[PDB]
mmCIF file of N, CA and C in Angstrom:
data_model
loop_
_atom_site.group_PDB
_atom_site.id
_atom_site.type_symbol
_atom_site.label_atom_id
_atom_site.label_comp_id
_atom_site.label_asym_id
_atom_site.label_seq_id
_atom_site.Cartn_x
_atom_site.Cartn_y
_atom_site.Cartn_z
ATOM 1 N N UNK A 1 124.277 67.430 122.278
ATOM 2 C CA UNK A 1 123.651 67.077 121.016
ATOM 3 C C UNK A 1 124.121 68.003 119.892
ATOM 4 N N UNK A 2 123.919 67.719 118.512
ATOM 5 C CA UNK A 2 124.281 67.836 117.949
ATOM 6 C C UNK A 2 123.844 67.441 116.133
ATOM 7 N N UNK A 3 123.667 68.296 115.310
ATOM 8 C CA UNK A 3 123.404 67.909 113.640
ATOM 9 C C UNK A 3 123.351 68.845 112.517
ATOM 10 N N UNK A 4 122.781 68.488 112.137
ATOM 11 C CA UNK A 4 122.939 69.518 110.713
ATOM 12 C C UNK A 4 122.529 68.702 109.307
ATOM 13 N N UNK A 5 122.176 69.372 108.274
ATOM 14 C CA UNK A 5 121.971 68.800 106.758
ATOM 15 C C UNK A 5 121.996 69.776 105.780
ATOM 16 N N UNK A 6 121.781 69.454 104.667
ATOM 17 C CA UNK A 6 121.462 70.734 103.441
ATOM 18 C C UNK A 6 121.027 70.111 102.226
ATOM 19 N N UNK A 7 120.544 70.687 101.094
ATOM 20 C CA UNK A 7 120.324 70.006 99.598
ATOM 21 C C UNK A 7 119.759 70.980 98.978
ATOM 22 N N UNK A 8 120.087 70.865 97.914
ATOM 23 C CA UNK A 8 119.933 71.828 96.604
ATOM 24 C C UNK A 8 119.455 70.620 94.995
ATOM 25 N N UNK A 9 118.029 71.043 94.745
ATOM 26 C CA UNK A 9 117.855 70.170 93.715
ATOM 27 C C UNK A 9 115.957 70.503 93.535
ATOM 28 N N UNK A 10 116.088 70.976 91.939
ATOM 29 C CA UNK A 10 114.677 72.090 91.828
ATOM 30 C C UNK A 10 114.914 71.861 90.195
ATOM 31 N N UNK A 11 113.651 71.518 89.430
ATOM 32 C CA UNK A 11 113.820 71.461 87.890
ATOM 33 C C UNK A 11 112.301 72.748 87.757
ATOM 34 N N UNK A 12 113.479 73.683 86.973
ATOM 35 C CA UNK A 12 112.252 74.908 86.982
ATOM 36 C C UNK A 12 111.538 75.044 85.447
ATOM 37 N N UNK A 13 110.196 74.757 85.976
ATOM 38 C CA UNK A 13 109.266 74.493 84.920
ATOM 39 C C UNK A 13 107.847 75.360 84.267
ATOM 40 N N UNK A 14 108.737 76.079 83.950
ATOM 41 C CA UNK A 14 107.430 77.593 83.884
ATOM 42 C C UNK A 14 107.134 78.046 85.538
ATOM 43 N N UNK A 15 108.041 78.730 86.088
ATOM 44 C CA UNK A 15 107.886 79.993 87.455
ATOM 45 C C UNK A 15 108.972 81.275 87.332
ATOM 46 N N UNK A 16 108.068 82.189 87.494
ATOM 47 C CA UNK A 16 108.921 83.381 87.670
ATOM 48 C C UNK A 16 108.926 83.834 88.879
ATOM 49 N N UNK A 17 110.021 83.212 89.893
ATOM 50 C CA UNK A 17 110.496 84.072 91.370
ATOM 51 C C UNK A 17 111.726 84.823 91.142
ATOM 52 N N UNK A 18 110.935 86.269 91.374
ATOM 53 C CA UNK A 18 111.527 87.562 91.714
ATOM 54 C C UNK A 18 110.580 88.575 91.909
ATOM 55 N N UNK A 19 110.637 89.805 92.260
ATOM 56 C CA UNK A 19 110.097 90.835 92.405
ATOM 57 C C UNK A 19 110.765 92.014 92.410
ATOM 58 N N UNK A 20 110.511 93.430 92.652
ATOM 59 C CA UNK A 20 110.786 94.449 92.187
ATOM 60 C C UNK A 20 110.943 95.841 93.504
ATOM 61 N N UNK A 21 109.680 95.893 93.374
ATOM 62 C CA UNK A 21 109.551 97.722 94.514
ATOM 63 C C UNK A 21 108.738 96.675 95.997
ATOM 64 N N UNK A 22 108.749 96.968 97.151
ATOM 65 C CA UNK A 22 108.136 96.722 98.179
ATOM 66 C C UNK A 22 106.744 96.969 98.444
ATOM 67 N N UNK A 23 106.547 95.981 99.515
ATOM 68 C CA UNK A 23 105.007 95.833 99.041
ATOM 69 C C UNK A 23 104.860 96.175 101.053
ATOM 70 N N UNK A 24 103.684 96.850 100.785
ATOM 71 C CA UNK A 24 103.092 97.431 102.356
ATOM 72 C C UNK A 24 103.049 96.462 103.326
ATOM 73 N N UNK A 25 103.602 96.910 104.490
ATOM 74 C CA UNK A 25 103.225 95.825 105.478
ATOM 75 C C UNK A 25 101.335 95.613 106.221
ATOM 76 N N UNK A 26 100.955 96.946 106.017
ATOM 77 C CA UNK A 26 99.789 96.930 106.164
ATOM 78 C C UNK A 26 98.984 95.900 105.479
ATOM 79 N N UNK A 27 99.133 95.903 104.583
ATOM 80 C CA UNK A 27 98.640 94.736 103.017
ATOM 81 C C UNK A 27 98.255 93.568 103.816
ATOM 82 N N UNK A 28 99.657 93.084 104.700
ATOM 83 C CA UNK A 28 99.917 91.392 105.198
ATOM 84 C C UNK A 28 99.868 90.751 103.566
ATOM 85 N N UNK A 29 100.639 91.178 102.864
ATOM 86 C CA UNK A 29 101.022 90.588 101.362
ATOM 87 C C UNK A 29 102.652 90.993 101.248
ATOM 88 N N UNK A 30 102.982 91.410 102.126
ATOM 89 C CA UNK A 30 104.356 91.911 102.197
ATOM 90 C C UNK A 30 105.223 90.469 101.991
ATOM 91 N N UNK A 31 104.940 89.519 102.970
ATOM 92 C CA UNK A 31 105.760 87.867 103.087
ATOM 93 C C UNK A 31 104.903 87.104 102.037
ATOM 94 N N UNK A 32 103.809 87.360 101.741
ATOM 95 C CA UNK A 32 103.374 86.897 100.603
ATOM 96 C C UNK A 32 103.032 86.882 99.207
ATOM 97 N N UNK A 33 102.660 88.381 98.975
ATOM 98 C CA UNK A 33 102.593 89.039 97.925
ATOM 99 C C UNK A 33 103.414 89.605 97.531
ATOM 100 N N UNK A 34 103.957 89.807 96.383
ATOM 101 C CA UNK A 34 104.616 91.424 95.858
ATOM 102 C C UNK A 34 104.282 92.359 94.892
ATOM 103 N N UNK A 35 104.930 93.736 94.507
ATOM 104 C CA UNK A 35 104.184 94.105 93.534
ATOM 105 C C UNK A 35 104.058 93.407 92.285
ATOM 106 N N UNK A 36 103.212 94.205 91.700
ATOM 107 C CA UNK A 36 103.040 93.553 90.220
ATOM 108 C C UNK A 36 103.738 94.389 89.319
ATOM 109 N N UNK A 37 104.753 93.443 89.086
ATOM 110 C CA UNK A 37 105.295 94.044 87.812
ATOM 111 C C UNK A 37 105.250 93.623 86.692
ATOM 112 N N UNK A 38 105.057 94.706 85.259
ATOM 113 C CA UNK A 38 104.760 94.351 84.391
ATOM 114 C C UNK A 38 105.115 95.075 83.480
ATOM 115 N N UNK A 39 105.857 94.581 81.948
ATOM 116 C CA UNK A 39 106.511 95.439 80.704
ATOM 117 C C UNK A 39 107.907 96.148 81.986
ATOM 118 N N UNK A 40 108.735 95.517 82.268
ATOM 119 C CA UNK A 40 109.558 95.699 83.076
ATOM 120 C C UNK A 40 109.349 97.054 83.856
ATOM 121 N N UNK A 41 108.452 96.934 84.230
ATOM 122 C CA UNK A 41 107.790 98.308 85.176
ATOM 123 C C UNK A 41 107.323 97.627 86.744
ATOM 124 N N UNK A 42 106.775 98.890 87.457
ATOM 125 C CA UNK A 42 106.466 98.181 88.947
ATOM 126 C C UNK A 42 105.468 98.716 89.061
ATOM 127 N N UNK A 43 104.142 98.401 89.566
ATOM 128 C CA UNK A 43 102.863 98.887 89.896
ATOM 129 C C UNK A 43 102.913 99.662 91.330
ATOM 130 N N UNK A 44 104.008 101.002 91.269
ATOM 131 C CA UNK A 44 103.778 101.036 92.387
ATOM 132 C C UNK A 44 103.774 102.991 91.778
ATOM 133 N N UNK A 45 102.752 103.752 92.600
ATOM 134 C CA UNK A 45 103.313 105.165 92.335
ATOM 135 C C UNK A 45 102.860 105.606 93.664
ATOM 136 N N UNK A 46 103.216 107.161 93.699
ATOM 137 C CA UNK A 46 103.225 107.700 94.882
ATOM 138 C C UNK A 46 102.700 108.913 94.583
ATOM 139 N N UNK A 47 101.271 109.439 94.874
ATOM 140 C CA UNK A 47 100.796 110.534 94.370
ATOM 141 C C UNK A 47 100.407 111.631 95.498
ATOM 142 N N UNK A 48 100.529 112.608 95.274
ATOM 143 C CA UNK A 48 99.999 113.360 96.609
ATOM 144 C C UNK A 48 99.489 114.867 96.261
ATOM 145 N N UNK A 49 98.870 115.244 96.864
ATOM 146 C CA UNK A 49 97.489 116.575 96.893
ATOM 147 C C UNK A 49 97.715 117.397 98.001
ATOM 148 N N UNK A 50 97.917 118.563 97.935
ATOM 149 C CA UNK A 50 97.487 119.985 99.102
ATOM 150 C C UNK A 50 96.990 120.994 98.391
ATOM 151 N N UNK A 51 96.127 121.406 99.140
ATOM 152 C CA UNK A 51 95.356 122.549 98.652
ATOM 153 C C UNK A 51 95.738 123.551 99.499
ATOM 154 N N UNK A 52 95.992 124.728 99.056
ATOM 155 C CA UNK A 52 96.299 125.863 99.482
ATOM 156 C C UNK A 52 95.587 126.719 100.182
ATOM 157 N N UNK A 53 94.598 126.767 99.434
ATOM 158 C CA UNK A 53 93.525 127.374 100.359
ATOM 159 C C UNK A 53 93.039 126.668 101.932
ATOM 160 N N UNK A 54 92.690 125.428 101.383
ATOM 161 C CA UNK A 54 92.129 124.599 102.733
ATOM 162 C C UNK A 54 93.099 124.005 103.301
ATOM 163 N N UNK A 55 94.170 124.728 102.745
ATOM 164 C CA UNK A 55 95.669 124.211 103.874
ATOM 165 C C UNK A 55 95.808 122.626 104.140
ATOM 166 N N UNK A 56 94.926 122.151 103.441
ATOM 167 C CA UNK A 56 94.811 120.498 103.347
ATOM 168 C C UNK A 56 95.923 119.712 102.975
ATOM 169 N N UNK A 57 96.162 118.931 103.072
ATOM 170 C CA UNK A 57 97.583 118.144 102.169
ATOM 171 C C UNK A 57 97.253 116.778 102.726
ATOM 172 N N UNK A 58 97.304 115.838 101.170
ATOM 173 C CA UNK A 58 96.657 114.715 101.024
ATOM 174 C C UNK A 58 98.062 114.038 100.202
ATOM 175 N N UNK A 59 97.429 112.584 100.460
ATOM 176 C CA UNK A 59 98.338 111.988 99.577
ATOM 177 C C UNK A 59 98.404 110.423 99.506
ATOM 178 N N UNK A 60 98.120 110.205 98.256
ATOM 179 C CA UNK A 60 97.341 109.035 97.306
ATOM 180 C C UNK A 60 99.092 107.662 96.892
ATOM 181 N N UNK A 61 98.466 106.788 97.574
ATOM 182 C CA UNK A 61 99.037 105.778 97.323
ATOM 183 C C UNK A 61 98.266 104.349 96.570
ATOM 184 N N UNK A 62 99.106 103.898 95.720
ATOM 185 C CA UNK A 62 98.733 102.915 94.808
ATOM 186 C C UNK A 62 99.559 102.235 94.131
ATOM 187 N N UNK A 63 99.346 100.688 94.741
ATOM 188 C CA UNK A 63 99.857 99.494 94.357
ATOM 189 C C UNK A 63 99.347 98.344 94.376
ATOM 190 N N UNK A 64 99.648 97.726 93.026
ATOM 191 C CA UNK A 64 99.189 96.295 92.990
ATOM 192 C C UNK A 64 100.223 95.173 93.268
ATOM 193 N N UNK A 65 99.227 94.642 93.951
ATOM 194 C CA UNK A 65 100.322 93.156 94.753
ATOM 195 C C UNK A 65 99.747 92.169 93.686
ATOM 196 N N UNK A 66 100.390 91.013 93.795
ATOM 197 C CA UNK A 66 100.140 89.855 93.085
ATOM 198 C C UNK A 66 100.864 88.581 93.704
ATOM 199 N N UNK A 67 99.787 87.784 94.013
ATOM 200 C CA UNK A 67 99.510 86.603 94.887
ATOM 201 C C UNK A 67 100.791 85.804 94.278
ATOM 202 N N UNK A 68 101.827 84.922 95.267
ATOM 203 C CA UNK A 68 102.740 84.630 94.110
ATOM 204 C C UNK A 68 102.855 83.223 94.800
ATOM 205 N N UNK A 69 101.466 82.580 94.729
ATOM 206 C CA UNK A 69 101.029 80.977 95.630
ATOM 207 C C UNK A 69 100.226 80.437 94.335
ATOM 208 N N UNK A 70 99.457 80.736 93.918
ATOM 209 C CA UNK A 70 98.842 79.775 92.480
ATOM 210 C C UNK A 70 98.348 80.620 91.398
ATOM 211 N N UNK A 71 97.507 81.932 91.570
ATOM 212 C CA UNK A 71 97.170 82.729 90.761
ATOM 213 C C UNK A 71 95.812 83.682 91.244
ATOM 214 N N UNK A 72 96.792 85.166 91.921
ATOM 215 C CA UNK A 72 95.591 85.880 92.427
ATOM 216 C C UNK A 72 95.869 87.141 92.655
ATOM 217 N N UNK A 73 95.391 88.531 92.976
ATOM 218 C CA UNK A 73 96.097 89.761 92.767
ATOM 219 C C UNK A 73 94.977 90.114 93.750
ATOM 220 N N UNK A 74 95.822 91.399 94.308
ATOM 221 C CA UNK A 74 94.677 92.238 95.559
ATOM 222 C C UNK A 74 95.241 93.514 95.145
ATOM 223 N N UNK A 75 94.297 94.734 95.325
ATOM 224 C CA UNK A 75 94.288 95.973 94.909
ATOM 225 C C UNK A 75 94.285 97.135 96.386
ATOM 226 N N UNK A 76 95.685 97.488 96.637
ATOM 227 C CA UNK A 76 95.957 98.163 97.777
ATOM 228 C C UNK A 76 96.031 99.805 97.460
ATOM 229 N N UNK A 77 94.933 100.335 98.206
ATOM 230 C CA UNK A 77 94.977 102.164 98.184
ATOM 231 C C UNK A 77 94.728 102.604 99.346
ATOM 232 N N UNK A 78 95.815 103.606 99.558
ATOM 233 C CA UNK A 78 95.805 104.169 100.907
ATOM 234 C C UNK A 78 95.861 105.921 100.451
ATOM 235 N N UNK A 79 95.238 106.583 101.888
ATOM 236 C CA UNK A 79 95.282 107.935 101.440
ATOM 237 C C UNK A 79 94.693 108.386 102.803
ATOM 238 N N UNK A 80 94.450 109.438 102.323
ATOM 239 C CA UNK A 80 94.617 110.356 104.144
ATOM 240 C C UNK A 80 95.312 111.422 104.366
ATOM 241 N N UNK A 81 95.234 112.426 105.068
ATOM 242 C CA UNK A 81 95.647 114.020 105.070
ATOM 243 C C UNK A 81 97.320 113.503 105.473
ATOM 244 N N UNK A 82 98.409 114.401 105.696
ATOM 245 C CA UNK A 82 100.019 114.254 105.923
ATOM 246 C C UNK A 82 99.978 114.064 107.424
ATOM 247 N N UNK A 83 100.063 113.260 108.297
ATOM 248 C CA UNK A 83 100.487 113.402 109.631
ATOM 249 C C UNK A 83 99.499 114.148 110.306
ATOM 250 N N UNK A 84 98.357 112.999 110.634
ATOM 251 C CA UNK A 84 97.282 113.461 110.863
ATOM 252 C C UNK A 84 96.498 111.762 112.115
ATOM 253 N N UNK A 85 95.078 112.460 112.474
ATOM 254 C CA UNK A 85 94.526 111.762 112.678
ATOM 255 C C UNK A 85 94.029 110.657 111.898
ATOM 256 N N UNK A 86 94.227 110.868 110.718
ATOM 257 C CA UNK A 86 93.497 110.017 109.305
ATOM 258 C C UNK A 86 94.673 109.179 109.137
ATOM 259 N N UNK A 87 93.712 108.029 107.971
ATOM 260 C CA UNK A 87 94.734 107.231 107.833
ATOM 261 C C UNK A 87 93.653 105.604 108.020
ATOM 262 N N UNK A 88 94.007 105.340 106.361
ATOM 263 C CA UNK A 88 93.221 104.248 106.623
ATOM 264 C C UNK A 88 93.582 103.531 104.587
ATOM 265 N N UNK A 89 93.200 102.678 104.717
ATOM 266 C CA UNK A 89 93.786 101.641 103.645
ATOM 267 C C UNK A 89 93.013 100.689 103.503
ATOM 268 N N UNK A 90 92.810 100.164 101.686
ATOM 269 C CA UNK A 90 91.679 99.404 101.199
ATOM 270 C C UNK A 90 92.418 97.762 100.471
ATOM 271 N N UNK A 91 92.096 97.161 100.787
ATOM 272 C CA UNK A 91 93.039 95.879 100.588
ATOM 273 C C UNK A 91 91.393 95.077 100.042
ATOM 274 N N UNK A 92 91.852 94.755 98.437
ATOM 275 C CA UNK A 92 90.312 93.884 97.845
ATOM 276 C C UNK A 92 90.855 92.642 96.686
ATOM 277 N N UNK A 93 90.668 91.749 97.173
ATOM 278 C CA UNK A 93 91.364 90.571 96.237
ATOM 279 C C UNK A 93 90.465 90.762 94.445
ATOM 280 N N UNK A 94 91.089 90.700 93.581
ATOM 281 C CA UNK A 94 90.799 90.660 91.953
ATOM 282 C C UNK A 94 91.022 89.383 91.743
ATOM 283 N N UNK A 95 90.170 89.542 90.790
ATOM 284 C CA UNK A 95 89.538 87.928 90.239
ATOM 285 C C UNK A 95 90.164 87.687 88.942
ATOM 286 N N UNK A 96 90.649 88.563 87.988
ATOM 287 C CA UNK A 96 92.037 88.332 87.315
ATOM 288 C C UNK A 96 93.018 89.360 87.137
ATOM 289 N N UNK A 97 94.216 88.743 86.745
ATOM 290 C CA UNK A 97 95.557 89.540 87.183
ATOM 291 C C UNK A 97 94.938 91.017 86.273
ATOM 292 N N UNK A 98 93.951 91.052 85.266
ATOM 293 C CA UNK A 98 94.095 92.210 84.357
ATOM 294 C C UNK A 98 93.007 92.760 85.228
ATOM 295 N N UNK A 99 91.475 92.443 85.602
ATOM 296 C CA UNK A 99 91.324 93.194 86.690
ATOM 297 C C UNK A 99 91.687 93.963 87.626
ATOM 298 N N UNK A 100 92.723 93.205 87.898
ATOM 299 C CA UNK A 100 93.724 93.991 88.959
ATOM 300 C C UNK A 100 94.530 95.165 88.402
ATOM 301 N N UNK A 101 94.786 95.082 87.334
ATOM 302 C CA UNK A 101 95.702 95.557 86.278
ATOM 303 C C UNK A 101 94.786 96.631 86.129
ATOM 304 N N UNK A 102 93.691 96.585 85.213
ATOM 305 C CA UNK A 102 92.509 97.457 85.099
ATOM 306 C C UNK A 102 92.548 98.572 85.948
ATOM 307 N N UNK A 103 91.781 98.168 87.162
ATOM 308 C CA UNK A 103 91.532 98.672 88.658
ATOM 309 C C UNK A 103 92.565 99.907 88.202
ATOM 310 N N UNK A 104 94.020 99.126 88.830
ATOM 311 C CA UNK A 104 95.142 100.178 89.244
ATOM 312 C C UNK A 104 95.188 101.032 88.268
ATOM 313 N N UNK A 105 95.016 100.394 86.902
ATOM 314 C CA UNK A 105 95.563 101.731 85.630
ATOM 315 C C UNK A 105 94.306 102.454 85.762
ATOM 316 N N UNK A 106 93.066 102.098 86.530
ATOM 317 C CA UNK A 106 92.063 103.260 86.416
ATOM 318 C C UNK A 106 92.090 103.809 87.500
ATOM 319 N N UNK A 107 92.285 103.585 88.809
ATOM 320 C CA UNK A 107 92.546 104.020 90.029
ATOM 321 C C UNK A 107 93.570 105.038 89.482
ATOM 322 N N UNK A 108 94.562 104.785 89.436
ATOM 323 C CA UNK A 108 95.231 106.129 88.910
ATOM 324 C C UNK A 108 94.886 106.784 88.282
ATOM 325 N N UNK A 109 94.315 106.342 87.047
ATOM 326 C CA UNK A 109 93.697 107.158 86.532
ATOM 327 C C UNK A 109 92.664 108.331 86.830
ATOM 328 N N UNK A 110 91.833 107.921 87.888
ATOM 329 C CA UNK A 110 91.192 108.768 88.322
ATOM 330 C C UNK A 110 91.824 109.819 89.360
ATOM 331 N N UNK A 111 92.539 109.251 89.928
ATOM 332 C CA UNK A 111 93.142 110.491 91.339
ATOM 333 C C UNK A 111 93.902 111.474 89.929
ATOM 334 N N UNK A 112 94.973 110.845 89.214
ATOM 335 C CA UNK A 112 95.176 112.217 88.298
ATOM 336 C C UNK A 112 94.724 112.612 87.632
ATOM 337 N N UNK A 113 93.454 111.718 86.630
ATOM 338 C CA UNK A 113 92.639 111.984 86.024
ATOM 339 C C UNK A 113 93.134 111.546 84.286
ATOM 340 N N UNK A 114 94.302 111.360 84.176
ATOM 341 C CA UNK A 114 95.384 110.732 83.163
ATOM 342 C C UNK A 114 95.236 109.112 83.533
ATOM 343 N N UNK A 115 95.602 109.027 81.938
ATOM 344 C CA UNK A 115 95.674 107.364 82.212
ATOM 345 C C UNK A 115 97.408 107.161 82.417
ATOM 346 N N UNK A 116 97.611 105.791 83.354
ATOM 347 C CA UNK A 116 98.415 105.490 83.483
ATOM 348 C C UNK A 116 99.649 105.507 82.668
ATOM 349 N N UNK A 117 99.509 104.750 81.637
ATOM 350 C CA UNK A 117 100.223 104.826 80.368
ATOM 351 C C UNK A 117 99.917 105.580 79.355
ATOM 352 N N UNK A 118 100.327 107.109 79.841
ATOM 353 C CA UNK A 118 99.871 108.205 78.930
ATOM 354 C C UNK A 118 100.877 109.158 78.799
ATOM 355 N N UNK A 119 101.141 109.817 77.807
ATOM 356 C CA UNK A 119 101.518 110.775 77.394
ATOM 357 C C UNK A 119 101.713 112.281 77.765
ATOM 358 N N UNK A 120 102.594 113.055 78.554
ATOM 359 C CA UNK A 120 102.148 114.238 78.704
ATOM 360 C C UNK A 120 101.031 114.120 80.383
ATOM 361 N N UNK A 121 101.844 115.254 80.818
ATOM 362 C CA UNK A 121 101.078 115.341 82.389
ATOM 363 C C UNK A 121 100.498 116.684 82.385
ATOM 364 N N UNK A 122 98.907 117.053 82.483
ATOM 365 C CA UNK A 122 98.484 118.241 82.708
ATOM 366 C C UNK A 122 98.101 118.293 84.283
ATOM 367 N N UNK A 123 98.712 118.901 84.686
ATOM 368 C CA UNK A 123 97.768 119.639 86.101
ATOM 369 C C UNK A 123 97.123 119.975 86.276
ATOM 370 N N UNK A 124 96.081 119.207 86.760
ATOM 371 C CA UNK A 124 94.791 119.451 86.933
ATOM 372 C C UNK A 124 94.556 119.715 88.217
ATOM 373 N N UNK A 125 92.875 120.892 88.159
ATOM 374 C CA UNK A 125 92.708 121.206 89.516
ATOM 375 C C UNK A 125 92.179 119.988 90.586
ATOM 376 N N UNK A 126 92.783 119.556 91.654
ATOM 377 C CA UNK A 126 92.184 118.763 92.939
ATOM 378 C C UNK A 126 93.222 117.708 91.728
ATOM 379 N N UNK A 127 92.973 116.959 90.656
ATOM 380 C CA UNK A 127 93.714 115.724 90.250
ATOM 381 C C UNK A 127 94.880 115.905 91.183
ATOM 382 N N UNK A 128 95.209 114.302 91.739
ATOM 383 C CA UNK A 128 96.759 114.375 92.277
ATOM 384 C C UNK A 128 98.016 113.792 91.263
ATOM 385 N N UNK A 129 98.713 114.366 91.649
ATOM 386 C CA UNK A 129 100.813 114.394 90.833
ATOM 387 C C UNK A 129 101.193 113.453 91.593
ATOM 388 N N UNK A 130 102.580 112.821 90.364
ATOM 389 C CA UNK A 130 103.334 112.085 91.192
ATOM 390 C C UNK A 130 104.337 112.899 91.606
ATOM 391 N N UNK A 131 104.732 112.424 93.154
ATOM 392 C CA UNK A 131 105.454 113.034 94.358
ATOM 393 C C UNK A 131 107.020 112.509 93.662
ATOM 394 N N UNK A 132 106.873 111.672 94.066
ATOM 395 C CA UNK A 132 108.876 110.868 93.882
ATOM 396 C C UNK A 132 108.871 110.726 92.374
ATOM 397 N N UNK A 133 109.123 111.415 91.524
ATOM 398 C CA UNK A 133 109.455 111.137 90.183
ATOM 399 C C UNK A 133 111.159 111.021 89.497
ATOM 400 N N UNK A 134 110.974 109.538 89.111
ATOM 401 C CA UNK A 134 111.948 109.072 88.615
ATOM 402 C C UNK A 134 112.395 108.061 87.438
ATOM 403 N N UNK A 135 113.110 107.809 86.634
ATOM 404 C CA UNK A 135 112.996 107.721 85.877
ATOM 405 C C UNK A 135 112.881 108.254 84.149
ATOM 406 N N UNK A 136 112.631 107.756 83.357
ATOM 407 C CA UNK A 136 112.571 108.369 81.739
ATOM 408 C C UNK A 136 111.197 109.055 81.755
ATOM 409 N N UNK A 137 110.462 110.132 80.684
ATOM 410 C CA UNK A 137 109.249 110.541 80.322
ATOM 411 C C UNK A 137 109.085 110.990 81.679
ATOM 412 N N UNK A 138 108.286 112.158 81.334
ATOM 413 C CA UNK A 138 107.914 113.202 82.509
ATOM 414 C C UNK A 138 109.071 112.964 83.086
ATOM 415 N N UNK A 139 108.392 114.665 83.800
ATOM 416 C CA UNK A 139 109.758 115.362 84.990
ATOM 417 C C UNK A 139 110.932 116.179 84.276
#
């Protein structure tokens, strides 16, 4: 036995397929979701915390996925000491994309204590830094 076929034929009518930075497999939004990107940026940062004294070392992850099936966004934060027993991750569907949007620019906001789209990075005590810094502004 034996066959085969193929076809190509799609009139694109208001959709934007593409995406940007990778999205967690933990999520299970990885084959479905991706990040949210937005103002040609990616909702994705990588923040992390050790304390010296309590020899602790932490480290704050945060990204927004966005449903890319009809219109829906989930808000993914993970965190937990470095190579440890810990380790655990919050996956919560938003009810609009700026909710979601919200969330993350305040979720960050709070672990560094800076708003997302801000100016100038102070180090603050316990606030967490971004780890992988790249890119223009800061660093």
């Amino acid at each position: 036995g034996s066959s085969g076929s193929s076809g190509k034929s799609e009139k694109r009518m208001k959709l934007t397929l593409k995406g940007g930075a990778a999205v967690d497999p933990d999520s299970g939004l990885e084959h479905s979701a991706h990040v949210l990107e937005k103002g040609g940026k990616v909702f994705s940062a990588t923040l992390g915390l050790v304390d010296i004294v309590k020899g602790t070392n932490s480290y704050y992850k945060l990204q927004l996925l966005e449903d890319d099936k009809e219109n829906r966004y989930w808000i993914f934060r993970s965190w937990g000491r470095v190579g440890t027993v810990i380790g655990s991750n919050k996956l919560e569907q938003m009810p609009s994309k700026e909710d979601a949007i919200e969330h993350f620019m305040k979720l960050y906001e709070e672990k560094t204590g800076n708003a997302w789209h801000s100016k100038n990075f102070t180090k603050y005590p316990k606030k967490f830094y971004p780890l992988e810094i790249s890119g223009p502004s800061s660093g």
